[PDB]
Every structure is written in C-alpha cells, then in structure tokens.
Amino acid sequence: ASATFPMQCSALRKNGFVMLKGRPCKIVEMSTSKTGKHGHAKVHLVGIDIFNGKKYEDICPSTHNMDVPHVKREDYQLTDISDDGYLTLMADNGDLREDLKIPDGDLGTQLRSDFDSGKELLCTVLKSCGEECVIAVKANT
C-alpha cells in the first residue's frame, strides 16, 4: 500500500514516472555528468509534475534506486456540480464522492460547459501519492 517503489536509476526511461523532490513526475530528460574515474555516476533527471506541470530536477547515481510512483486512474460518472464547484462523481459500484473539484484550465471550462449542456460525462481521475484530480472528460451515451 506504499505510494512509491524502488527502481534502479539505470532502469529509468524517458516518459516513465519518477519521484523528483517529493512530487510524482514523468521523466523528460536523462543524461550523465561528472564523476571520479573509478566507477560511479551522476545522472541528471528532468521531469514534469503529473498534476501541476511544474518542472523539477535532481541528480542520482546509476547504481542506486529511485522512488517511482504508482499511478492509477479510474472513471467516474458525473452527476452534479455544486455551487462550491465540487463535482459529484459516481464509481462503478455506485459510491459517490464529492471531494474533487472542477479541474483547472481548459478542461474544467469544457467540463463546466458540457454539463451546463445536457451531456452525460465520464470523468477520468488521476491518482498518485495521495493526490487525485480529473484529467480527462469524455462524453457518455
């Protein structure tokens, strides 16, 4: 039930998930840099926060592990939007959750409009490291 698991830095790949500075990211760049000439490594890692979009960075030995998030998604059916801007989301087993808000950016605006219209919507919730949010909205019928 851990939120992150070890992986050897030499096993990391571009567009894979990695933890940078406590945030779950997608690796966007990797390269080598500077050592002592007897068997070590400093891999430079860049990654985009999978929720924010912020860019982060760190340096790690090829030999030793990194922390890698479990990243999951689940689809909910959208049934309401409150004045507070919270969504009412219904899981496949019927349970409701109203703790997720209208997402940021263009997605939240589309979501708001499509539901102001008459459309049945599925919201895909991204989940990782104790953080969750709607990342995709898809028409239903």
Decide if 4 contacts 19 (C-beta within 8 A). Answer: yes
User: 3: Cβ–Cβ under 8 A, 6 or more apart, which residues?
Assistant: 69, 70, 128, 129, 130
Tokens of 141: 């019928």
Approach to solving: X-ray
Residues 55 and 89 reside in one and the same domain: no
Residues 52 and 88 reside in one and the same domain: no
In angstroms, the CA 3 to CA 138 distance is 27
Number of domains in the chain: 2
Length of the chain: 141
Residues 80 and 138 reside in one and the same domain: yes
Residues 87 and 140 reside in one and the same domain: yes
Query: C-alpha dihedral over 21, 24, 27, 30, to 10 degrees?
Result: 20
Decide if 49 contacts 128 (C-beta within 8 A). Answer: no
* Other C-beta atoms lying within 10 Å of the C-beta of residue 100: 17
Choose the final residue of a domain: 70, 100, 123: 70
Residues 75 and 63 reside in one and the same domain: no
Give the domain range for residue 9.
1-70
CA angle 25, 28, 34 (to 5 degrees): 105
Residue 38 sits in a domain of what CATH number? Answer: 2.30.30.30
H or E segment at 83? none
